Design a protein around this ligand. Structure first.
Ligand SMILES: Nc1ncnc2c1ncn2[C@@H]1O[C@H](COP(=O)(O)OP(=O)(O)O)[C@@H](O)[C@H]1O
Ligand SMILES: [Mg+2]
Ligand SMILES: [Mg+2]
Ligand SMILES: [Mg+2]
Lengths: 356, 164, 164, 187, 187, 164
């Protein structure tokens, strides 16, 4: 009866039941192997970490079956063959992957009904909008997907390899400058918690650094799991600043404030006006306090002065892509739109292309 | 998607879009601007008889058809709309209908996702409509200039019988 | 090591960890929290039918699933446990199972060494379990905050339907 | 488009340095298929079409159905997103715009040039598409010289290497007399 | 780690004074083996590998298979307990992080320095490990100068002993004018 | 850094890089490959008149411009070089100049550090040069294939008038 929603995140798989306010199972997407513990078990244990969804596209299919089996049995604690599971895919997904996903779901778990939706259109609908470019900055990639009345333009979808993983790596690199040596995978979780709890995007990086070099009120204090109290100074705004100045990591690609402008300028000229005033942000990486103001300032610096830029950022943009799918699967009139196993048996794996 | 349209909304749209020769006493109860809602079960698009605007009253009790229409939209929920505009261009005088998609940020996500994913289920059944107006903030829909900007841009000199 | 697990405990664990679509009359006799013991010969891990907690009774006769569970553990012997927690985090609402290793100091060494050296023989057969809770003193397991500290740390705001 | 479709397999070429490698792959391994839809059917099943390219750092990456998908945009610009018709239909639209009596000498004298027309098998596809577009009565002959990449430079070099061309140049004296407008009269 | 593994035989070096003796033993008797697993097999059987060190107090202690086990940690950090890969894999991970077109000049220009790289036979082990890690097509050349221990100081000494370097220093006047930030512009 | 360049080397580079219309008798004394050295005081980059190669002699006394050039470099000292290559590609026939940084391991550190830290002082003054060839071992610079590998990679089919 109840429908499952397994969001295939690049660094966090969000799973739960349709109708809830937030996903129930949230665990990192890693498949540990010694020199096969999947998900949360790999962090506790000598293993080589592998990501099958590293860059938004499933390149290692062999581990995706184990990921989904774990998510269904040890995380959701429900049988997959008795509950329909809705799935989300990253934009610019090839047809072969879209067919393989539903083929695996229908042949391994034998779930009675499934559905594949796009993360961009779901995140856009979750903000009460149907036309507007969405900024999907996840853990592995950062996508800029301009959508028109619920139809994303695949030719203007920009993909950026800068995401929360590189931010965590840069934070690990800059924390050793003070003396805090976090090198192992266990301390990586502490660095991620520090980034989530103490980092923020500054309105003006150069001006903020000037005050941080002199004032002492900006220095915060974090409590390590072992009881030690480490202090972080100007690293609160330097870590999320990479999203706008990727020279910190070393990639030549422009920041998330310029790729958006480059993608908007690639669509139709008559729909550019509805894209500048409908910029929606999503993903866990856009949860920094003060990122919307910086994005608006940078776009207004880039965009023409005549037209106005409105940047809306919902407070639930971290799990908006999962909440959208949950609400779509919890509809009392959606039970007839699923892809039942009979239609699959008739039409092969290509049914998902016609239905979706 | 999901939610479909009922027969009453389709009948109202066919009644408003295509007008015929009518008596002067009956012509005053035509539908000027009607909103659309969801039932208890959230499975059909139904118009609410409570909030509405007649053609007869326009220019009488309702001094401004658009001004009295902004406050009619609830700010705590998502709503559809269908406004029959009578704007004057430099080039000529036109009379078109406008589809207003009202979706404030203060509404819960359950009412936003349902109304955003089922927009193609209602807009496809409304054949012949051209002017689409998507409004999320209240200040942007409250302003009078935005309607002339969406309808004809800078060409619209007067909106609803009065200049801009 | 030595002591191995029987088929009944493995069946109970597979029954509790993976739930399926069930009737509303049968769903009330599911196993909520079950302990594990040793037989007369101390060679198999067996659950005792006497001390147990059903899912049906939780919220009815048992006002507090955890509160009525602390006193169920004998303080003069070593015991295993399997608690199905329903805690609320700031981030979301989760529902996981907890493995509680009860080992008081008042128990004899013969019951402590057997249960400590054979812990890998039972924990390895319980696939997919994550939350491990080793408790020796009675005061540390009696407290309610320790479960939220082990499960999610400071993030758990509410435990078992009630705030901390 | 090749950079965009190579990331679908897992090869992330985003920087300007990897752009040269993508260009080399396009120059060495891409080819225009005679029938795109039929070729894709065999590429989805057969494994002999997959080639192997050697990166400058020693890595060996394999390219599958991207050999014919990249040059297919020239005939189906929907891959990039432009509404303009492919190079096979713009030619027909331009031929139909000239005089009606000289259209016969234009269908049988289609010459291709530029470095982009160096894909093996583009002349056959162009001929097929034009014969599908053009009337059936008149014949279409598509000639493609093997040196069409630098033909525009070879022509100028041979024209400037003529022993009787030294008097046709625009000397500086004529420029001083006539201003920059001398090029319009001379050429 | 040498202090830890010397107590396995019976030599208890715990104080700071004996730490200098352990360091001297590591500097004079340790060496990197070409194959650790194969070398340990011969060390467990043969007796010619056991050396003899003279303590400052006159005692003669013998060291067996601890000559190659101590520097082996640089390639297998599991001996100390850190999860980070050995110095043979971090080099490959850092080379793969630069530009793709300059990776070829980095594999054939691996230079070693510091006092820790003074073990006899470390260059061959590094070359073997990199050739195992790096692609087979491109070649790996590992050069190790005999003065790599003080090369970082010799370089600075030669740079400061130049007859044309006296005008490149940062004099105190420029410091007084520009504050401490002068070093960023000058260097 | 330190060591700078003199006027003679800059004049020679401007003479070699940019050729003009010259008489057939004078064109045979152009500079084909010239090395660079240091004076007694090690403060200026000076070319030695002793070791050099003319354009006139190439193809006559010097059967191979590159073959007779490897032995011209001293193996006991660090040297600069400037080789004018005439290689044939599959695509076309090109004629470019190559900057060879000769630095053997048998040379003392005093001659290696000076020539390595002052490389940016000479390379910056040589405007328009593209092909950079850093060679340390003698066997790698003695081989003929390395020049075609650095110049154009696998595309160079012939080097200096003869196939590979
Ligand atoms: N409150 C927060 N502040 C900063 N970063 C956060 C926050 N919440 C999550 N993140 C980052 O977001 C990443 C997870 O993103 P994810 O939800 O997996 O994106 P997607 O669903 O698009 O894959 C984590 O690596 C984490 O570092
Ligand atoms: Mg996402
Ligand atoms: Mg041209
Ligand atoms: Mg050093």
């Amino acid at each position: 009866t109840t429908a499952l929603v397994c969001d295939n995140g690049s660094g966090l798989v969000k799973a739960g039941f349709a109708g809830d306010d937030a996903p129930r199972a949230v665990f990192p997407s890693i498949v540990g192997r010694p020199r096969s513990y999947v998900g949360d078990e790999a962090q506790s244990k000598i293993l080589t970490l592998k990501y099958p969804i590293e860059h938004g596209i499933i390149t290692n299919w062999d581990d995706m079956e184990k990921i989904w089996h774990h998510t269904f049995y040890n995380e959701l604690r429900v049988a997959p063959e008795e509950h329909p599971t809705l799935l989300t895919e990253a934009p610019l997904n090839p047809k072969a992957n879209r067919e393989k996903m539903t083929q695996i779901m229908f042949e391994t778990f034998n779930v009675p009904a499934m559905y594949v939706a796009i993360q961009a259109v779901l995140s856009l609908y979750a903000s009460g909008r149907t036309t507007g470019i969405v900024l999907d900055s996840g853990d592995g990639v950062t996508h800029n997907v301009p959508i028109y009345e619920g139809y994303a333009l695949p030719h203007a979808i920009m993909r950026l390899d800068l995401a929360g993983r590189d931010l965590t790596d840069y934070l690990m690199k800059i924390l050793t400058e003070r003396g805090y040596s976090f090198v192992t995978t266990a301390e990586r979780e502490i660095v991620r918690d520090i980034k989530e709890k103490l980092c923020y995007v500054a309105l003006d990086f150069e001006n903020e650094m000037a005050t941080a070099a002199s004032s002492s009120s900006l220095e915060k204090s974090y409590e390590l799991p072992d009881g030690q109290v480490i202090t972080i100074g100007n690293e609160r705004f330097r870590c999320p600043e990479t999203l706008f100045q990727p020279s910190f990591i070393g990639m030549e690609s422009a920041g998330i404030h310029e790729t958006t402008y480059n993608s908007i300028m690639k669509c139709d000229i008559d729909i550019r006006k509805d894209l500048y005033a409908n910029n929606v942000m999503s993903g866990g990486t856009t949860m920094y306090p003060g990122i919307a103001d910086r994005m608006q300032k940078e776009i207004t610096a880039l965009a023409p002065s005549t037209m106005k830029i409105k940047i809306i950022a919902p407070p639930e943009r971290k799990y908006s892509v999962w909440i959208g799918g949950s609400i779509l699967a919890s509809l009392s009139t959606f039970q007839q739109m699923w892809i039942t196993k009979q239609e699959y048996d008739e039409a092969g794996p290509s049914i998902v292309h016609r239905k979706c | 998607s999901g939610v479909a349209v009922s027969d009453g909304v389709i009948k109202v749209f066919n009644d408003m879009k295509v007008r015929k020769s009518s008596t002067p006493e009956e012509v005053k109860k035509r539908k000027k601007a009607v909103l659309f809602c969801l039932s208890e079960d959230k499975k059909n698009i139904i118009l609410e008889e409570g909030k509405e605007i007649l053609v007869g009253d326009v220019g009488q009790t309702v001094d401004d058809p658009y001004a009295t229409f902004v406050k009619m939209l609830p700010d705590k929920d998502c709503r559809y709309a269908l406004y029959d505009a009578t704007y004057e261009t430099k080039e000529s005088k036109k009379e078109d209908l406008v589809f207003i998609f009202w979706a404030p940020e203060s509404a819960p996500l359950k009412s936003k996702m349902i109304y955003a994913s089922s927009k193609d289920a209602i807009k496809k059944k409304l054949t012949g409509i051209k002017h689409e107006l998507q409004a999320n903030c209240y200040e942007e829909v409250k302003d009078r200039c935005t309607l002339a900007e969406k309808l004809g841009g800078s060409a619209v000199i007067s909106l609803e019988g009065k200049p801009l």
